[PDB]
Design a protein around this nucleic acid. Structure first.
Lengths: 101, 54, 206, 146
RNA sequence: UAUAGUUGAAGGAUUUGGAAAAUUCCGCUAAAGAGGGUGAAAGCCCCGUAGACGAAAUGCUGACAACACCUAGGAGGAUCCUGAGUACGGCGGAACACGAGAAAUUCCGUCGGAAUCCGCGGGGACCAUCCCGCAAGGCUAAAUACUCCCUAGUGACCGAU
């Protein structure tokens, strides 16, 4: 998975190159994860309890993890995350000159 | 009857040819006799063949 | 015949001598074709079957009477013409493998190797060694030796540190000196082989 | 000869004959079999040698002969087989054989008298045609029924 | 060792696109170029593979411990033992490639009924010489046949009649 709920992210593929954001929800069990301002979709909502009207809304849609990097925050780039045996947990450890997340 | 109490004679079957070997089926029963004999000292009644009666 | 020699950089030492009874034989052809076809066509797996009339989960009760309906006559629901019936003469599991006379095998191997030497394709290397199996060096070994096309490598025995660097681009493929077959030579263009593997080959081949 | 240029030995592979695929092959509609008749059902044809109704040949002529239980037939080698053991080698029904001449000595080796020998070998076998001893002792060899 | 696992190398840009793994430059890794997935076709995005490590519990297989059990020579030949309604014969059927045939060998039903080592059975009717064996008391792993089921794989095997 290598991606948690709150974890900034770069997008590599799919009409949102280079655009970053914050992961909101994590769906493992189908490998989908939704971010902010990357997958805007227009929903023809019908008049409902919520939103008595029927506006055209704009929310985000899931993206497959093969389109998502992780972030440095110590530095600010993308790292093909590796794992290290730091003290008795496995804290993710960046590649590309040794960061610690 | 079914068997002998002492040995194991029992009914069986074999063919029967006649002057032109037309094969049919038959029965061969073993000779048997009901007799009152001692068992453990308790006299029983049981089937014993006429070959183990010597 | 005579072939040149190099190690990995030490280039063009004295040559090597090989007998003409094995590596100079002006190859027959029909043998080679036939041994190729046989060897290759011995790799099949005959596993393939098909249900037929008595194997289909059907029944032996007629559809209806023999007459009356004016219709045609039918014996069983399951049968060749009906949809969902058995097949007639479908494929069954078989063998496909078969051997040749014992002499033509040897004639085939001899003919193949003589053919390859006939155009300066056996490149005899002195001796290959790597302490650790570093894949990159092998590439440089061939780059020095100027073999880029599809190639084949023959080794002597368990000096595995020279095989553990032969999972390259499939341009290379590795094999010891006991398994040299027909295809694993005919399918390639150049052939590398150490100096000891040459003699070893020249032993088993009598 | 390379993988993508294979050529079989010429005239060494025929094609096939698939029968009943259309009236131009010449074998459609009765599959090269003709009209009705029990030669033309599935699995027709009578057993071998059967002859309609005639008493077939094998019952028209009589039985004869028996077979001795203990016949003995030898493994004849005539005379020119010997003519490669130049002069003194102790020909023997044994490791002589061991040369690609006579395997499976059936019941001992005989020797015959066809057709010409000029050597001085020494012959050991288990029988001899009367002319063969004369040929051997003519060139001056030996013999022994051993 | 079987049943959960852990670790696991290397990429950017440009042109077409809605989307690149495509195309063109310039790089890198491989004991890892088997495979599957990602907005089209990926050695370098993801799951993995080559390697390297790993069991508190339960099961199997070894090994050596301890305990259980079993097993001795030589010389003598006076007398004793060596499987009974058994072997085998007639009769009527079956089993042996052998359909009673000149028919040995093996069983079954019925009746008749042996000897005891100077003895007995067999060598395809039967007799004689010779040769080979000791029935009518039991036990015995492996090499052989199968696959409802589980694990991992393969296929010039099918692709909704």
């Amino acid at each position: 998975m290598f991606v948690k709920k709150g974890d900034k992210v770069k997008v590599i593929t799919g009409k949102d190159k280079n655009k970053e954001g914050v992961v909101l929800a994590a769906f493992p069990k189908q490998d989908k994860v939704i971010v902010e301002g990357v997958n805007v979709v227009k929903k023809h909502q019908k008049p409902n309890q919520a939103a008595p009207q029927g506006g055209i809304l704009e929310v985000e849609a899931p993206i497959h993890v093969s389109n998502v990097m992780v972030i440095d925050p110590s530095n600010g780039e993308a790292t093909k995350v590796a794992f290290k045996e730091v003290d008795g947990k496995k804290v993710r450890v960046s590649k590309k000159t040794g960061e610690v997340l | 009857a079914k068997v002998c109490y002492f040995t194991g004679r029992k009914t069986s079957s074999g063919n029967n040819r006649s002057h032109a070997m037309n094969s049919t089926k038959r029965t061969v029963k073993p000779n048997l006799q009901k007799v009152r004999v001692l068992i453990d000292g308790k006299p029983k009644k049981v089937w014993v063949s006429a070959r183990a009666l010597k | 015949p005579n072939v040149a020699l190099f190690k990995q950089d030490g280039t063009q030492n004295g040559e090597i001598t090989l007998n003409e009874e094995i590596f100079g034989i002006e190859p027959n052809e029909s043998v080679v074709y036939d041994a190729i076809i046989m060897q290759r066509a011995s790799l099949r797996q005959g596993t393939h079957a098909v249900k037929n009339r008595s194997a289909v989960r059907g029944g032996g009760r007629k559809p209806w009477r023999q007459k009356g309906t004016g219709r045609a006559r039918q014996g069983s629901i399951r049968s060749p013409q009906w949809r969902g019936g058995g097949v007639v003469f479908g494929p069954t599991p078989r063998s496909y493998s078969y051997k040749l006379p014992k002499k033509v095998r040897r004639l085939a191997m001899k003919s193949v190797l003589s053919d390859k030497v006939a155009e300066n394709n056996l490149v005899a290397v002195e001796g290959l060694s790597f302490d650790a199996p570093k894949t990159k060096e092998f590439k440089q070994v061939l780059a020095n030796l100027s073999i880029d096309t599809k190639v084949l490598v023959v080794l002597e025995n368990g000096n595995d540190f020279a095989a553990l660097s032969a999972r390259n681009l499939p341009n290379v493929s590795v094999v010891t000196s006991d398994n040299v077959s027909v295809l694993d030579v005919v399918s390639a263009n150049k052939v590398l082989a150490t100096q000891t593997a040459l003699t070893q080959i020249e032993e088993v081949l009598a | 000869m390379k993988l993508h240029e294979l050529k079989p030995a010429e005239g060494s592979r025929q094609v096939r004959n698939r029968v009943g695929r259309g009236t131009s092959s010449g074998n459609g509609k009765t599959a090269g079999r003709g009209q009705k008749g029990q030669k033309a059902r599935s699995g027709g044809g009578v057993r071998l040698g059967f002859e309609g109704g005639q008493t077939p040949l094998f019952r028209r002529l009589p039985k004869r002969g028996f077979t001795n239980i203990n016949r003995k037939d030898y493994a004849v080698v005539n005379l020119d087989t010997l003519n490669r053991f130049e002069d003194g080698t102790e020909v023997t029904p044994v490791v002589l054989k061991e040369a690609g001449i006579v395997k499976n000595e059936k019941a001992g080796i005989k020797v015959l008298a066809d057709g010409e020998l000029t050597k001085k070998l020494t012959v050991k076998a288990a029988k001899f045609s009367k002319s063969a001893q004369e040929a051997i002792e003519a060139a001056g060899g030996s013999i022994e029924v051993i």
